[PDB]
Short mmCIF file of C-alpha atoms in Angstrom, two decimals:
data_model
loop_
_atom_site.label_atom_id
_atom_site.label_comp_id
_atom_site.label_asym_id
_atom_site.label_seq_id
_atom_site.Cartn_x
_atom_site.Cartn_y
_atom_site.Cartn_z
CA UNK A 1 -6.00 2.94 37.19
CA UNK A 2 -8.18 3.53 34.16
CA UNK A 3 -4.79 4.69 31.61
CA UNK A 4 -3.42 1.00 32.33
CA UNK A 5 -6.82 -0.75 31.94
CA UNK A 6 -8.27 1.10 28.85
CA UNK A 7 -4.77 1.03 27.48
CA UNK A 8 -5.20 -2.88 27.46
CA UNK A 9 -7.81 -3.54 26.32
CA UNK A 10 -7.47 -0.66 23.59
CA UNK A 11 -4.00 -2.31 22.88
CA UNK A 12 -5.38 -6.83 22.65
CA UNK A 13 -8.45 -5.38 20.35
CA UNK A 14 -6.70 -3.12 18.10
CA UNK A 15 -4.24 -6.43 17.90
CA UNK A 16 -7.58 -8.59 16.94
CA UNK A 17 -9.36 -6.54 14.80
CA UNK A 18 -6.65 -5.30 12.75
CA UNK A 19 -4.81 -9.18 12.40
CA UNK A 20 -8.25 -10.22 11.28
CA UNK A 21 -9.50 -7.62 9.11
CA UNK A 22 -6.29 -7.47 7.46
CA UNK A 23 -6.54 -11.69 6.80
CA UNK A 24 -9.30 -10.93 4.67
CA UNK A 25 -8.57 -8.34 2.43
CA UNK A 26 -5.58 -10.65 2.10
CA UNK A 27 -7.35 -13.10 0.77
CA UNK A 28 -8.72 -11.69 -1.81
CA UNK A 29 -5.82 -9.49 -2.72
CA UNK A 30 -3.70 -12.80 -3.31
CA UNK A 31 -5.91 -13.70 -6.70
CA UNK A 32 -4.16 -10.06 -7.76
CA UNK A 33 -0.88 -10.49 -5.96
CA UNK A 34 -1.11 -7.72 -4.28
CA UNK A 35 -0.22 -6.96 -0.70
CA UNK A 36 -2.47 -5.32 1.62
CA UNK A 37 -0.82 -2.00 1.95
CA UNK A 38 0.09 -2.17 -1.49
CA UNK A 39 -3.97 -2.22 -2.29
CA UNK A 40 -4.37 0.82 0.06
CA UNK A 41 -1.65 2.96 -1.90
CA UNK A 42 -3.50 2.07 -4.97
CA UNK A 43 -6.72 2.82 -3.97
CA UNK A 44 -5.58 6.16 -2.02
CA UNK A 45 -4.46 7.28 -5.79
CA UNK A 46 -7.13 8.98 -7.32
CA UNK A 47 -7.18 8.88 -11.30
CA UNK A 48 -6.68 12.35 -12.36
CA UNK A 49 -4.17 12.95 -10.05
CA UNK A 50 -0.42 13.12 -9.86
CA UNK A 51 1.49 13.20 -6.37
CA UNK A 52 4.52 13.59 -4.71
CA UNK A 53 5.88 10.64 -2.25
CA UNK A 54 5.69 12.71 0.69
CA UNK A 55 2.21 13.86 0.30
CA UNK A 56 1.26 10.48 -0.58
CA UNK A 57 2.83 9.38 2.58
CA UNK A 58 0.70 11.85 4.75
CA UNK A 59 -2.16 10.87 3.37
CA UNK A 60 -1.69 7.00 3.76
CA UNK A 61 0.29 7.35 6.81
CA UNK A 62 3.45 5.71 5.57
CA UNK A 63 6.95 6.50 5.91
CA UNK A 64 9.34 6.74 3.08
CA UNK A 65 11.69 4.00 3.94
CA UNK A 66 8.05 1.68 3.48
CA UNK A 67 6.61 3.91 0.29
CA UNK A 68 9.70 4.07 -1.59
CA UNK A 69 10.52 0.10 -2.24
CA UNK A 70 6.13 0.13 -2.34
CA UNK A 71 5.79 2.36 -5.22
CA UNK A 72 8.56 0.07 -7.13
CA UNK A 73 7.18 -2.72 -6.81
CA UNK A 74 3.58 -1.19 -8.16
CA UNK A 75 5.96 0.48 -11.05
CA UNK A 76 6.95 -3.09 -12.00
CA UNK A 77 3.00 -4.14 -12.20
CA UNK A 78 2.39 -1.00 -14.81
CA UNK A 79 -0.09 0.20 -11.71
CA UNK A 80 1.73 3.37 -11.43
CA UNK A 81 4.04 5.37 -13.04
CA UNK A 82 6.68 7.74 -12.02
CA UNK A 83 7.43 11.10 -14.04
CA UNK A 84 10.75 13.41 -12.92
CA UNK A 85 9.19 13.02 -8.86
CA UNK A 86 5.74 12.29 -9.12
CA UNK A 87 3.22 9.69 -8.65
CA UNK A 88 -0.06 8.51 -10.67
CA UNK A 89 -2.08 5.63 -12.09
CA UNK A 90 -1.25 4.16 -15.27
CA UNK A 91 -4.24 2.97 -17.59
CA UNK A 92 -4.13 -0.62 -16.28
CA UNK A 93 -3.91 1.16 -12.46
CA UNK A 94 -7.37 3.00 -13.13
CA UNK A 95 -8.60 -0.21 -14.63
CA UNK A 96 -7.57 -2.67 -11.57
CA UNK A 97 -9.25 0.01 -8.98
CA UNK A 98 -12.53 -1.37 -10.58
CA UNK A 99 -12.49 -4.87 -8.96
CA UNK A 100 -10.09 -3.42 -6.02
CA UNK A 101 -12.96 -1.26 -4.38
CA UNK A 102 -15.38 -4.18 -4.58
CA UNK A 103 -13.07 -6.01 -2.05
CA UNK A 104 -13.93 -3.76 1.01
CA UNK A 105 -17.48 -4.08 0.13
CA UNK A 106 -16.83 -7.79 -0.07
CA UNK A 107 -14.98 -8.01 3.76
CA UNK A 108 -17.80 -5.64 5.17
CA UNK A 109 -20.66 -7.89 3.83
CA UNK A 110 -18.42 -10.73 5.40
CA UNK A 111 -18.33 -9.40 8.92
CA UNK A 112 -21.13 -10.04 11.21
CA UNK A 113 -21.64 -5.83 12.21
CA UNK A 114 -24.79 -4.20 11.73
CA UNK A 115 -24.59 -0.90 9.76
CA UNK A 116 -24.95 1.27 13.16
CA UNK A 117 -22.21 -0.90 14.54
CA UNK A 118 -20.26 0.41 11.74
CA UNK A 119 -21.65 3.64 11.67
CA UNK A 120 -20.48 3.94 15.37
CA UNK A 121 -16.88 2.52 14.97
CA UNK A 122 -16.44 4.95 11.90
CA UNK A 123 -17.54 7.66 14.18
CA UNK A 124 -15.16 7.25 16.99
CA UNK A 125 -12.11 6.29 14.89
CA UNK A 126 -12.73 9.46 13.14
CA UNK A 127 -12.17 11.39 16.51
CA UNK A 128 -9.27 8.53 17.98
CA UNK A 129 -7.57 9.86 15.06
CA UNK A 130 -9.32 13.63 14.59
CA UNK A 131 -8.27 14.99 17.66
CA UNK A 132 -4.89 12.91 16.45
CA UNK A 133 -4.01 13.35 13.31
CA UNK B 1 -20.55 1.99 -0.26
CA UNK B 2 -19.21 5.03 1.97
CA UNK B 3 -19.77 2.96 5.30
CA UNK B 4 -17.32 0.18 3.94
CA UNK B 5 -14.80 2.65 2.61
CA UNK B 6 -14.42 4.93 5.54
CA UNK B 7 -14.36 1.76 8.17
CA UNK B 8 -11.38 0.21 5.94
CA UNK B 9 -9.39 3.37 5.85
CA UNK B 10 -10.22 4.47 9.05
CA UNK B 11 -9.09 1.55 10.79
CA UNK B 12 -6.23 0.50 8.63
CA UNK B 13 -5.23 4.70 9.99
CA UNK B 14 -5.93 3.69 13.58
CA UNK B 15 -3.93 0.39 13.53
CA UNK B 16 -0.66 2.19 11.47
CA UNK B 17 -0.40 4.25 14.29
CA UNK B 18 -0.47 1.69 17.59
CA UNK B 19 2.06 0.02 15.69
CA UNK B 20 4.06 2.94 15.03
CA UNK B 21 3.89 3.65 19.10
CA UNK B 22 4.42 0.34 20.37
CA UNK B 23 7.93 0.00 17.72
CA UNK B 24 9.22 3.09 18.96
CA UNK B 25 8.85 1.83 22.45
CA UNK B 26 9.71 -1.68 22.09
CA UNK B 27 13.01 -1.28 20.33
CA UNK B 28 14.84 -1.08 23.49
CA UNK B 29 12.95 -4.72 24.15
CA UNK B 30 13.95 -5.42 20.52
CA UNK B 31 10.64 -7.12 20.66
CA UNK B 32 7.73 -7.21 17.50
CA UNK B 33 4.23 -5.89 18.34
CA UNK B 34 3.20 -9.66 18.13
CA UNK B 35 6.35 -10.57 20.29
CA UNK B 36 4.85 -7.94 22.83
CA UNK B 37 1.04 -9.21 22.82
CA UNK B 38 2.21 -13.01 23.34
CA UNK B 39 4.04 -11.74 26.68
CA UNK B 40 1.41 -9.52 27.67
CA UNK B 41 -0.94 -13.00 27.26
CA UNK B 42 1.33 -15.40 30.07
CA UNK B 43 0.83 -14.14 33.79
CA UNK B 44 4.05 -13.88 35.93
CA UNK B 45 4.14 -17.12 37.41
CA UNK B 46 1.98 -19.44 34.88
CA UNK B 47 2.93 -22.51 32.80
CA UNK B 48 0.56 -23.01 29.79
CA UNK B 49 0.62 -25.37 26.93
CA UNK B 50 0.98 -23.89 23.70
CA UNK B 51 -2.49 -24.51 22.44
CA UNK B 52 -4.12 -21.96 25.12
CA UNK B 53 -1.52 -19.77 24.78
CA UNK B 54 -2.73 -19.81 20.76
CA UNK B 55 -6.80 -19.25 22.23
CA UNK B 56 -5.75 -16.26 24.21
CA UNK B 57 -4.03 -14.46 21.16
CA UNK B 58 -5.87 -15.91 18.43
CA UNK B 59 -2.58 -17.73 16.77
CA UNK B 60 -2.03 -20.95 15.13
CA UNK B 61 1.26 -22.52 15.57
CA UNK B 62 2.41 -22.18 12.16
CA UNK B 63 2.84 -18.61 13.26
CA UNK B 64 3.06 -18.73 17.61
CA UNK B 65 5.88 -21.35 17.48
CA UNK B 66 8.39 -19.36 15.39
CA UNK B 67 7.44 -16.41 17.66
CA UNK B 68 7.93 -18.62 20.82
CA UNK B 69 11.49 -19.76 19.44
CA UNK B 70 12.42 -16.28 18.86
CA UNK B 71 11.31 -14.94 22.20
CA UNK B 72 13.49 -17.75 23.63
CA UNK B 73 16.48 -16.85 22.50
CA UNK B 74 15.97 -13.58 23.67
CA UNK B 75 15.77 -14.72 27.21
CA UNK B 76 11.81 -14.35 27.82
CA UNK B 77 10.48 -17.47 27.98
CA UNK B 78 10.90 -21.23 28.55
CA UNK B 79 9.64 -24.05 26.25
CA UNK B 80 9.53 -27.13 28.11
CA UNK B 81 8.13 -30.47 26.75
CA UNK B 82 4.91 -28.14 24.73
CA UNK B 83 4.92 -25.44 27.78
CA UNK B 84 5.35 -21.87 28.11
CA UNK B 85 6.29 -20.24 30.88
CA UNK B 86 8.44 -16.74 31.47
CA UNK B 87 12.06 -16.88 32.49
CA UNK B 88 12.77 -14.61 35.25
CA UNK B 89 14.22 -11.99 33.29
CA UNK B 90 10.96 -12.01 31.52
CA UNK B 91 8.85 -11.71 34.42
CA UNK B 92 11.39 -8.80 35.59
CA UNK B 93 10.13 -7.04 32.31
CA UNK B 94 5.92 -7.60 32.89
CA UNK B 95 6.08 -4.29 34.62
CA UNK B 96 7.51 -2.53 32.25
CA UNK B 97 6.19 -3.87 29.37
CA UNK B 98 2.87 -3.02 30.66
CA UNK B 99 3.53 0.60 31.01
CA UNK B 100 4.24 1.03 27.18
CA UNK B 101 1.15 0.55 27.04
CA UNK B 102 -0.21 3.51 28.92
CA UNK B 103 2.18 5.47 26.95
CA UNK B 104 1.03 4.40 23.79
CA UNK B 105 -2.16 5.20 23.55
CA UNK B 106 -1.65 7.84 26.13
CA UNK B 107 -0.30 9.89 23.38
CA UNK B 108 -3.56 9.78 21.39
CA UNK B 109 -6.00 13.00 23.11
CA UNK B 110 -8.12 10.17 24.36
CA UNK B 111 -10.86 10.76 27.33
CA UNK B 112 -11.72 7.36 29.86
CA UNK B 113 -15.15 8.08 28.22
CA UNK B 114 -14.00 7.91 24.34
CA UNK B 115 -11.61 5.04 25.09
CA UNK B 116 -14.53 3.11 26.28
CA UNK B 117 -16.61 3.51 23.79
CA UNK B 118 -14.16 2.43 21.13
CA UNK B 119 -13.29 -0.84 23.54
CA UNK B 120 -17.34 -1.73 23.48
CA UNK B 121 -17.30 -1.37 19.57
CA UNK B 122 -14.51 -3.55 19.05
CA UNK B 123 -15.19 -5.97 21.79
CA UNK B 124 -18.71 -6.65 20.77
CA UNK B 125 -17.11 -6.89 16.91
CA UNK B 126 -14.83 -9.03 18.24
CA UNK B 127 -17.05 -11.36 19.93
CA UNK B 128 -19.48 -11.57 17.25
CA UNK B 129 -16.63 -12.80 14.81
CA UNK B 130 -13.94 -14.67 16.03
#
């Protein structure tokens, strides 16, 4: 019935469209050797603020097993820094969220979907997770 | 500007927690997500070559042939000279596997209506794209 068939087809496009999506940010994250979810933490970091991990996990829906060895990694790029614990953006972090945001500009423009085909997919995600999260 | 932004987050959100569903459930499987969709993609009693096995789930074989070598050893499926099929325990599984599934996005608050509508958005992106 209609929770195995939805559930399918819900389950092979998610597979799709995320795979895909994600393949292009990933391309042009590479010229800053960043990963993917490493670009989301960054960007998810406003500049005048200072976090802790677990709030920063809520918010990008990360666990801390996958934030913790994360937020090293950006601590070794000078992208953010840690003070005794709390997150923010160094200089150079605020700086690289510059070009950063032009990259989901970039994939958008990339995609062949109208802006009411967007429109509509932001709309219902906002409720798939909404009434979810 | 705003469009762009909220459809990156918003589906990067959505597609953290599938994944998050379908590990739980598939640990007793110890299968990946990608492990899971590749099964999902051979019927119960089919032999197909490795190419349209690649079509139906949008892989090259740099990354399905790895994949196929791993779900091998776990007992799922036959490679025969290249041909995929399921072994029987992996048939015995289809069931199953298919159920997660259901539970999965069964634990979103999800209506047949608002599931549909999110399957004709992304199958009309998909089409139009890959």
């Amino acid at each position: 019935g209609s929770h195995m068939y939805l559930s399918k087809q819900l389950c092979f496009l998610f597979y799709v469209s995320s795979k895909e999506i994600i393949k292009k940010y990933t391309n042009y994250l590479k010229e800053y050797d960043l990963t993917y979810t490493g670009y989301i933490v960054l960007m998810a970091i406003e500049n005048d603020e200072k976090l802790n991990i677990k709030k920063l996990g809520e918010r990008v829906f990360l666990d801390s097993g996958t934030l913790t060895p994360l937020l090293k990694k950006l601590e070794k790029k000078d992208y953010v820094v840690r003070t005794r614990l709390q997150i923010s953006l160094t200089e150079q972090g605020k700086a690289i969220k510059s070009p950063l945001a032009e990259i989901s500009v970039k994939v958008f423009n990339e995609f062949n979907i109208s802006e009411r085909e967007a429109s509509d997919i932001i709309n219902n995600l906002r409720n798939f997770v909404s009434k979810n999260f």
